[PDB]
């Protein structure tokens with residue numbers, strides 16, 4: 492089974508992936524780590540073809556908001572120890588672009 | 596052609612990869628690009644089994660030194676445009692740790 | 700020019716088309732990249748498939 | 757026992773073992789982990805190899 496063709500992350504792709512993982516009951520609460528996340532990104536990359544360079548969050552401290560509008564996971568402190576926290580409002584409020592309009 | 600088994604990075608493996616990639620000349624002077632590098636790292640991950648989280652460089656501006664001791668490449672200017680420059684003495688001097696112990 | 704699925708594919712996104720090995724497709728769009736827009740001959744369902752997972756019939 | 761290569765390999769060091777598809781091997785150790793130490797029957801050289809690239813002869 493070949494590595495799927497590479498493609499850009501999208502708003503719609505980020506919304507489906509978030510709901511899918513939420514269904515899977517994984518990231519919720521899970522303590523964040525570059526390794527765990529790289530593992531995630533690589534899985535999504537292998538499986539769906541979304542190049543592993545989209546899951547960037549905003550600079551801390553506090554909650555880190557996803558730059559990818561449509562990705563419904565934010566990082567909530569619980570270096571701060573962060574936990575992946577689903578928030579469907581991120582599919583409706585591009586917080587990161589307001590806090591840091593420069594990235595866009 | 597399966598993704599090779601994972602295997603930890605080690606001074607020796609970083610030193611070996613440096614000379615390996617030097618043999619298959621191509622990085623020299625090649626203009627750096629996170630994408631170009633992400634591609635490189637994924638190739639080594641599938642090919643040789645080194646989880647893509649080793650080739651991290653120090654902050655800018657100026658020359659960006661490799662954080663993994665053994666990796667004999669640094670990013671040299673000409674924001675700031677960078678290139679991959681093989682610097683053999685990086686295997687004998689952990690510059691990145693000297694100048695940026697915060698990452699250690 | 701029909702195509703046949705060489706492997707199974709399970710979409711997660713909504714615009715992707717899940718399919719099983721042996722399923723046959725008719726490509727609607729293939730110039731927009733390496734993820735083609737295919738129509739299932741079996742179900743009439745349209746969506747994007749990893750072009751590298753299908754081969755001509 | 758003897759094993760054979762399903763695909764090629766290209767080592768980045770002399771401590772590992774490069775090879776081609778079909779090369780036979782004598783597994784000198786496989787209790788270290790997933791990268792086995794073996795001897796190429798087709799060259800008479802020892803080095804580590806990705807266990808998943810070789811299958812039993």
Ligand code: PBM
Nearest residue numbers: 529543633636647
């Ligand atoms: C685990 Pb990556 C190729 C930013």
Ligand code: PBM
Nearest residue numbers: 683684685687688
């Ligand atoms: C290449 Pb020196 C100054 C241990």
